[PDB]
Design an enzyme around this catalytic site. Structure first.
Site, mmCIF file in Angstrom:
data_model
loop_
_atom_site.group_PDB
_atom_site.id
_atom_site.type_symbol
_atom_site.label_atom_id
_atom_site.label_comp_id
_atom_site.label_asym_id
_atom_site.label_seq_id
_atom_site.Cartn_x
_atom_site.Cartn_y
_atom_site.Cartn_z
ATOM 1 N N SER A 40 0.779 -1.234 0.035
ATOM 2 C CA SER A 40 -0.034 0.015 0.019
ATOM 3 C C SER A 40 0.866 1.341 -0.081
ATOM 4 O O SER A 40 0.163 2.238 0.215
ATOM 5 C CB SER A 40 -1.102 0.027 1.086
ATOM 6 O OG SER A 40 -0.533 0.384 2.076
ATOM 7 N N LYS A 202 4.189 6.978 4.128
ATOM 8 C CA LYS A 202 3.051 6.002 4.011
ATOM 9 C C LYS A 202 3.656 4.580 4.052
ATOM 10 O O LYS A 202 4.758 4.116 3.392
ATOM 11 C CB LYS A 202 2.636 6.112 2.291
ATOM 12 C CG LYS A 202 1.307 5.141 2.030
ATOM 13 C CD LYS A 202 0.366 5.527 3.204
ATOM 14 C CE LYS A 202 -0.775 4.612 2.911
ATOM 15 N NZ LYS A 202 -0.819 3.419 3.566
ATOM 16 N N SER A 203 2.941 3.891 4.953
ATOM 17 C CA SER A 203 3.712 2.383 5.251
ATOM 18 C C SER A 203 2.964 1.524 4.323
ATOM 19 O O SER A 203 2.001 1.943 3.750
ATOM 20 C CB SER A 203 3.733 2.270 6.691
ATOM 21 O OG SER A 203 2.433 2.265 6.998
ATOM 22 N N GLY A 204 3.362 0.366 4.348
ATOM 23 C CA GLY A 204 2.786 -1.029 3.530
ATOM 24 C C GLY A 204 3.253 -1.858 4.064
ATOM 25 O O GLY A 204 4.328 -2.348 4.706
#
Length: 258
Positions: A40, A202-204
């Site tokens: 993501s 923004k992590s994923g």
């Protein structure tokens, strides 16, 4: 990069790193041409592409959400079935809550996966390979390039889209504030960099191979130009669990270079 090799040995993991100080142009690379599933973290790319075509003042335009749009893990959008939502709220949901339905709807607004790949090419990114929507893009396989990118291609694309792109000042602030205030990345890049640094991330996390990522625009104390930092990590076994301390420790070593 002796600290990075050691971190791989310490966490029994693979690390891919690309960092660009947009002020000096200095880059730190470690396994930067190795492919990883971006998961993501792609929500940031899709959000930026849409913001290139919708002025801030028109972010109030609404789109209808129906049952067919809903996908797994949509904490905000599941409440919108049969309702209308503005583009601004879609973007907020997608970034702040990693809402998957919001991200797919954003891809649709852009015109579909096909139009996203087109724009990546126009930006000179021939590596990033979006094939699937959420959540299927999280079914990563080392033997497949689907929904993967390399730390360098992904980092250069973030730079060209957001740090030195064609977004207006308002849209750019809007996106960046979402990234600054997101709490999901606290155990990641934000945990490893010094206290004077602002981290917009923004992590994923993919479903397989402990695929744990964090991308960010880091602002050292005193510098207004961000340092673009992409950290992609994974392990050798499909069901392995990731350790976030790996990313926190990676960000700390890399920061020493700037």
């Amino acid at each position: 990069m002796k600290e990075l090799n050691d971190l791989e040995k310490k966490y029994n993991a693979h690390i891919g790193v690309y960092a660009l100080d947009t002020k000096s142009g200095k880059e730190v690379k470690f396994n930067s041409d190795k492919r990883f599933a971006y998961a993501s973290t792609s929500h940031a790319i899709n959000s930026a592409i849409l913001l290139e075509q919708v002025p801030y003042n028109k972010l109030n335009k609404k789109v209808h959400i129906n049952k067919d749009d809903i996908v797994a893990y949509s904490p905000i959008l599941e409440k919108y079935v049969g309702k209308d939502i503005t583009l601004k709220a879609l973007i907020e949901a997608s970034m702040t809550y990693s809402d998957n339905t919001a991200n797919n709807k954003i891809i649709k607004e852009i015109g579909g996966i096909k139009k996203v790949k087109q724009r990546l090419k126009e930006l000179g990114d021939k590596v990033t390979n979006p094939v699937r929507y959420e959540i299927e893009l999280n079914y990563y396989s080392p033997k497949s390039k689907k929904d993967t990118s390399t730390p360098a291609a992904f980092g250069k694309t973030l730079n060209k889209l957001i740090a030195n792109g064609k977004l207006s000042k308002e849209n750019k602030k809007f996106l960046l504030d979402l990234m600054l205030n997101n709490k999901s990345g606290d155990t990641l890049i934000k945990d490893g960099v010094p206290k004077d640094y602002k981290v917009a991330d923004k992590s994923g996390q993919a479903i397989t191979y402990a695929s744990r990522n964090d991308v960010a625009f880091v602002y050292p104390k005193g510098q207004s130009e961000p340092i673009v930092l992409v950290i992609f990590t994974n392990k050798d076994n499909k069901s392995d669990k990731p350790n976030d301390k790996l990313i926190s420790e990676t960000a700390k070593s890399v920061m020493k270079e700037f």
